[PDB]
C-alpha cells in the first residue's frame, strides 16, 4: 500500500498571480489521479504540522526564527527575487515538512510500503540557513534526518531528479556519512552549484540542456546504481521534481512521463534489495499543469506498481 499525504492548507500559499509555483499545481495532481483512476490504489492521509525539533535537525535556530518573524499579517514579505511569504506560507511549509515526517513514521512502522507527499511549498533549495528558490524548509532532508535520529537508521539515500540541483540537501549533509545523495540536474543552471567540490557522499550528475531521457537513463544506470549497490541504503527519500519534463517552461530538459516511470522502477529495485521497500517521496518542482499531473501519476503508479 501507498500512502498519499496532502493538506488543503498547502493551497493557501501563493506568491502572486504571475508566479508559476502556484496552488493549481496541487489541483492538477488531484484531477489526474481522478482521470487516471489511480487515486483508488492509494490511501489518503492528512499532513500534520511539523514541530520545531523536526526543523532544527536540519536548519539553524536563526533560520526558523527568521521565517517565523517574517510571516506577514497581510500582503507579501519578500525572501528573494522570486520567493515571498503570504500570510499562509508558514502554515503551508509546516504541512509540507509535516507530511514528510509523518510519511516517514508510517513507512518505518509498516503502515505503508511507501508514500508520496503531494505538498507545497517545495523543499530541496532550502539550505540550513537559506530560504530561496520557492523553498523554505527542506522537507526531504527533514524526513531523512527524522529516520536517522528518531528511528535510529544507520544509512539512508536521497534521490533527487528535479531539474534544479538540490543545493539545500547538499548543504545539509556534506559531513554526514550516513547519507548518500544521488541526483541529476541541469548544468549550468539555477542554482549554479553542485558540479564542484563534491563531498564523497555526493553523487550529483550534471546534465546538458536539451538532453532527452536516454542520457538520464544511461547516467542513472552507469553512475547511480553502483553507488547505491555499494552503499545499501536502509531507506530511500525522493525529491520528486517533474520540471525536467519536455513541456516545462522552467527547465530545458526533455524527459517524459515514461522516464519518471522508469526512474521510479529503479528506485523500487534498490529499495526492495536493501531497504525493505521503504520509500518516502516529496513533491519538489514542476510547472506545466498537464505534464505535472501526468508525471506525478506515472510516479505514484510505479510506487503502487
Ligand atoms: Na537535482
Ligand atoms: Zn526545480
Amino acid at each position: 500500500a501507498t500512502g498519499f499525504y496532502s493538506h488543503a492548507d498547502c493551497l493557501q500559499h501563493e506568491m502572486g498571480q504571475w508566479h508559476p509555483e502556484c496552488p493549481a499545481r496541487l489541483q492538477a495532481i488531484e484531477d489526474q489521479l481522478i482521470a487516471s483512476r489511480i487515486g483508488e490504489l492509494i490511501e489518503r492521509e492528512s499532513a500534520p504540522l511539523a514541530d520545531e525539533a523536526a526543523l532544527l535537525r536540519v536548519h539553524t535556530k536563526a533560520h526558523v526564527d527568521y521565517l517565523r518573524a517574517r510571516s506577514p499579517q497581510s500582503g507579501y514579505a519578500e525572501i528573494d527575487p522570486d520567493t515571498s511569504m503570504n500570510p499562509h506560507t508558514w502554515t503551508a511549509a509546516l504541512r509540507a515538512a509535516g507530511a514528510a515526517v509523518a510519511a516517514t513514521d508510517a513507512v518505518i512502522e509498516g503502515r505503508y510500503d511507501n508514500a508520496f507527499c503531494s505538498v507545497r511549498p517545495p523543499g530541496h533549495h532550502a539550505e540550513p540557513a537559506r530560504a530561496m528558490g520557492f523553498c523554505f524548509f527542506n522537507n526531504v532532508a527533514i524526513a531523512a534526518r527524522h529516520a536517522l535520529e528518531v528511528h535510529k537508521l544507520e544509512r539512508v539515500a536521497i534521490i533527487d531528479f528535479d531539474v534544479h540541483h538540490g543545493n539545500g540537501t547538499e548543504a545539509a549533509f556534506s559531513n554526514d556519512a550516513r547519507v548518500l545523495m544521488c541526483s541529476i540536474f541541469q548544468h549550468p543552471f539555477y542554482p549554479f552549484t553542485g558540479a564542484d567540490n563534491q563531498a564523497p557522499n555526493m553523487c550529483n550528475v550534471p546534465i546538458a540542456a536539451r538532453s532527452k531521457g536516454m542520457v538520464v537513463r544511461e547516467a542513472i544506470d552507469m553512475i547511480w546504481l553502483p553507488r547505491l549497490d555499494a552503499f545499501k541504503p536502509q531507506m530511500l527519500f525522493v525529491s520528486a521534481g517533474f520540471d525536467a519534463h519536455r513541456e516545462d517552461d522552467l527547465g530545458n530538459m526533455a524527459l517524459v512521463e515514461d522516464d519518471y516511470a522508469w526512474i521510479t522502477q529503479q528506485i523500487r529495485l534498490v529499495a526492495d534489495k536493501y531497504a525493505k521497500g521503504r520509500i518516502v517521496s516529496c513533491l519538489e518542482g514542476g510547472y506545466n499543469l498537464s505534464a505535472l499531473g501526468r508525471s506525478v501519476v506515472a510516479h505514484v503508479r510505479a510506487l503502487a506498481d
Side-chain angles (χ1 to χ4, degrees), residues 124-125 162-164 243 285-287:
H124 75 147
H125 290 322
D162 191 285
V163 76
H164 304 105
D243 40 14
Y287 302 99

Side-chain angles (χ1 to χ4, degrees), residues 124-125 159-167 181-186 191 204-205 224 239 243:
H124 75 147
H125 290 322
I159 313 305
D160 189 336
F161 53 74
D162 191 285
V163 76
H164 304 105
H165 172 55
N167 62 296
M181 187 181 169
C182 293
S183 86
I184 58 164
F185 69 97
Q186 198 181 314
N204 300 316
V205 168
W224 290 10
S239 275
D243 40 14

